[PDB]
């Protein structure tokens, strides 16, 4: 009805500078007190 579909298919197509779609990624880090599951690379050195 008047209150209509709030979703809409994006205006891109295999045919479709401001209208260029950009991809985005985020690594949501849960900083709560918990066991470590993701840590950085510790580049070892020669002995």
């Amino acid at each position: 009805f008047n209150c209509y579909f709030p979703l809409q298919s994006y205006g891109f197509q295999p045919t479709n500078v401001g209208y260029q779609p950009y991809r985005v990624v985020v690594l949501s880090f849960e900083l709560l007190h918990a066991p470590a599951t993701v840590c950085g690379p510790k580049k070892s050195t020669n002995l």
Binding site: A34, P35, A36, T37
Partner: protein, 48 residues
């Protein structure tokens, strides 16, 4: 057991010829692998 979020599993496989009770000897259960689970434990049961 689980402490500070890291599950510590200990195991030991040794032979014995006795069926009455626990035999004489000493054995230290070795933690083979650490598991980061972080779960509370107050109850448990055996699945047979």
């Amino acid at each position: 057991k689980n402490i500070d979020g890291y599950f510590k599993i200990y195991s030991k496989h040794t032979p014995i010829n006795l069926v009455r009770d626990l035999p004489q000897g000493f054995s230290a259960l070795e933690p083979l692998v650490d598991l980061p689970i972080g779960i509370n434990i107050t109850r448990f049961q055996t699945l047979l």
